[PDB]
Amino acid sequence: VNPKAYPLADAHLTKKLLDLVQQSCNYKQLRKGANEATKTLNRGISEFIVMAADAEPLEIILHLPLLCEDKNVPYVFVRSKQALGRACGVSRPVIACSVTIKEGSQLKQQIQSIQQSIERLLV
Amino acid sequence: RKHTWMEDADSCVAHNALECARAIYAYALQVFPSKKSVWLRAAYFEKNHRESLEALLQRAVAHCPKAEVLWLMGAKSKWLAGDVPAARSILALAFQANPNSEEIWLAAVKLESENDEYERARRLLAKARSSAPTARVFMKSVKLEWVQDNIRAAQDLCEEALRHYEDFPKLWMMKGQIEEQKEMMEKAREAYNQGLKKCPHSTPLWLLLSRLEEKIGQLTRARAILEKSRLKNPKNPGLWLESVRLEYRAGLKNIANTLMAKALQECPNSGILWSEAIFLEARPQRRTKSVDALKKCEHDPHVLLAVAKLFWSQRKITKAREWFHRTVKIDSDLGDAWAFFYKFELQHGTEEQQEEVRKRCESAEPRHGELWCAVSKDIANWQKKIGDILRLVAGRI
Amino acid sequence: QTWYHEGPNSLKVARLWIANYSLPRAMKRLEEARLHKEIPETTRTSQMQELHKSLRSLNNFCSQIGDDRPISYCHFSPNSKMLATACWSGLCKLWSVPDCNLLHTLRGHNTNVGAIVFHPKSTVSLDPKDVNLASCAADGSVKLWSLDSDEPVADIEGHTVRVARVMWHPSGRFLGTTCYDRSWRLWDLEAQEEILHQEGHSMGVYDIAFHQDGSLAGTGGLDAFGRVWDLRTGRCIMFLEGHLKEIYGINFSPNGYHIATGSGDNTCKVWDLRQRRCVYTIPAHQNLVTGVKFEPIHGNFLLTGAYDNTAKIWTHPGWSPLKTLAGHEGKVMGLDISSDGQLIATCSYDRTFKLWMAE
Amino acid sequence: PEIEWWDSYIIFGITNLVEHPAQLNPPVTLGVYLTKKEQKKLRRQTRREAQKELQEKVRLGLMPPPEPKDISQGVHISVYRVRNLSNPAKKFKIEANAGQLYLTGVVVLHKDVNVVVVEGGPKAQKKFKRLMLHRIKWDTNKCVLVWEGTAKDRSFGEMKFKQCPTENMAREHFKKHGAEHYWDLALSESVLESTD
């Protein structure tokens, strides 16, 4: 993978992150795209920000952890956007899928658990 | 039936006029004697709508005994309108009917300290401390001893109040403010640390400790004290706002933005944190920050004052005046919002807007403000009026 | 299935020098332990109560911000000189403790810096113009740095994996480095080359630290097995087990028996060396315990950090929560006590570094 | 002690023999998201294929159609401290919580120190913490979580409401299952809360 992409999740961690991203996008709580993730990080309403390590170039998502250092949000980098290749109906693999807090989310606590799991990988 | 008549009199006072409402209030007062709440409501209706208010205060003092609030309102109406020694004689006559020195002795000490002959005020404070000692009476005696000069007797009274009322952080804060006005500053920091460790939750004592540790150099200890105050409450909005102000006062703008984001994530329903996030944001980014502050914290006086400051900074005087009017209608007791409204009236507008702002500041006394508490807690502007304090808060912006 | 492989003669010479430097050190440690055992229980209990009273009233002060990057590790200089911090950026500053003034920031890294631990005799008997501190980054680099030059030195290119931590030997001629290549390297200061690569774990080692006398060296990483390898010919017989998570912190006690290991399973394992078993499993915090620091030569406490905003200063032994050094705003990554024991720095993920001073 | 184990083993045992001892392991089929346009295409194709299959099965001449109308690899172990969890509703709920949530553990009671240790899965421990922290209303009697970590396997067999008037009996009962350090840390936290 890319050495600049940090942190790197495991297989089950990426599977749980993809399931949480699909549950957020199906319940209208996730935004795909780099500009939408940057706007969700600047607005302060994004609960989590996920990146993709298989990006050419990978520097375009390099501001995604740094904005996570500007809003106190967990950051994670899927080995490949292909994990979200279909994402929320996206034909092309998805990379920046800012998962924003959803009022009374049916998986709000589950998303919080993913956050708690994404804060321990960066050590 | 008396409560329904009082509600009808209040609705008549607020709906149309004041003659029939005062007649209904006089009929309810002469029909049957009520408690101090109806007398206070009649005194407020007489003060809001000179001679009639003094007559209502005399009727409440003659017909409703054991009413310290009505007697204090009558003494304040006599000192404001009639005379200061007549109000002192009225307070001395009300002290002969109510032997409790809780609020009558403090009001007499304040009336003797606002006028001349401070030895009589010191004797009244000593008599109140010898009759019924308390933390508020000791703090008032320490303030009356420290407003004249920083003598050793004021420091001894502050030490006695800190030894007798160590659970109360007001005596420790007064001792720290008395020691901070001297040449040394380590004694004030030690007194503030003792007040923060003896309360253990003291927000203004920890704020004064952070201000003393930041203003005297070595601001890393000030940041450590601010972190300990934020973790000792835990997650106080005032301590987070003080830490954000200390981070924004230095060159760490990204750390200040991260502290503001953490304060918004840990306490989104805070008007001071929303105002700090609106003031710390960029000029094209303030329109989204003010909208997010209005959506998260609606009908807030600090958010409305920040919106008024953003409208005045964007060369929109007609929007800043409307936002200041909305902030005065939402909360007229705010100090920072009234100071911003007076500054906007003095900067953009004629003398009529400044006169209306002065009348709004004189009708409702501003308190618990950002710029008002910085001038109301000092010893140099302790016995001053409300209009001069409002002018000093508007001129220092 | 422990397969053996022959090494160079320079590694055997360095092992013989380490044994000849550790055997009188172990004799002096045994003499000090016999002198402390001859002391009565009343004076020892009074000294332990005084140490507990000094550690309980430990207030955090001088929280000086290093940079915009969160601090990843911190190491106290010998003789209470300064404290070298290593943040998530390429700079490794050294703040003057307890003055909290940054001066002569040793930069030269590109990736996220790991553990920049100075030599045990850097400020004692080493020149400030020569190599005094050893820093590591997220890539493969173990760079030496001075204390008054602000420029790196010729690093060791024998590690091509993520070097998590690096710690110099107490003798000063060696330095261990825990890499992510399922091994731990041992570079030499006199030979200026890697002497050995002890692969005592199936996964990459995270924390590697030598003993107080320099005879043994504890390892630990993502393989959930702490290896205590001898510096003579390897043969790690004191294998530490029990932790179900990755060991991210290793701290050798000044006593010849106790050894502290910090893993991510919200516990700290104080294991014995004369019995090859785990003596205590102290639940110091609830988060992943990454940072851990042993006591000074008095040998009475242990400061274990975690991924929460606090750090537990527990007794050694006893495993009791005597002090909770809280006050940080992020994950406490990296912590080190001074040589005098009156000051201890605890780096956190809030881009700030404070010190616990006795009130 | 006279000397350490490594000092007695080395003292002559220094050689250039680099080895790799104790090569042991530390103690897949996954899907991805789909597309909305692909979802619509799949729904249309599936409905058409179902209709065609039904027509083929019921029109060929075989049957007339109707008229068209995991505790392993890491277990979450939590330990909470309550001032007076003796309440039967509270005590039974915690014990039953562990039982139903398979949170193998113990509930030890003492003089103003109630240590409730649960152990199981992460979702079961999260549900038990949400029940004991927000659902179970105690009130001076408050219940707070002392610690929450991960272990290799479960220590206790089933949730048993133990009872001990002294702290030494509860410490011996916790050391019989290997959880005396958690009870000692809970007692130290209770002593620090009562002292401060």
Numbering used by the authors:
A (entry chain M): 6 to 128
B (entry chain N): 539 to 587, 590 to 937
C (entry chain 4B): 164 to 522
D (entry chain J): 385 to 395, 412 to 427, 434 to 475, 536 to 605, 627 to 683
From the paper:
Here cryo-electron microscopy analyses of human CE pre-B complex and B-like complexes reveal extensive structural similarities with their CI counterparts. The results indicate that the CE and CI spliceosome assembly pathways converge already at the pre-B stage. Add-back experiments using purified CE pre-B complexes, coupled with cryo-electron microscopy, elucidate the order of the extensive remodelling events that accompany the formation of B complexes and B-like complexes. The molecular triggers and roles of B-specific proteins in these rearrangements are also identified.
The spatial organization of the tri-snRNP proteins in pre-BAMPPNP complexes was the same as in the CE pre-B protomers. Notably, in the presence of AMPPNP, U1 snRNP, presumably from the adjacent protomer, was now stably docked to the PRP28 helicase domain of the pre-B protomer, as evidenced by the improved resolution in this region of the pre-BAMPPNP complexes compared with pre-B complexes. This enabled the localization of U1 snRNP components and further supports the idea that the poorly resolved density element of the CE pre-B complex indeed contains U1. In contrast to pre-B complexes, in which the RecA domains of PRP28 are in an inactive, open conformation, in pre-BAMPPNP they exhibit a closed conformation. Consistent with the absence of additional structural rearrangements in tri-snRNP components, the 5′ss of the adjacent protomer is not base paired to the U6 ACAGA box. Indeed, the release and transfer of the 5′ss to the U6 ACAGA box would require ATP hydrolysis and lead to the release of the RecA domains of PRP28 from U1 snRNP and PRP8, as observed in the pre-BATP complex. Taken together, our data demonstrate that the tri-snRNP of a CE pre-B complex is capable of interacting in trans with a U1 snRNP bound to a 5′ss, which leads to the handover of this 5′ss from U1 to U6 by PRP28.
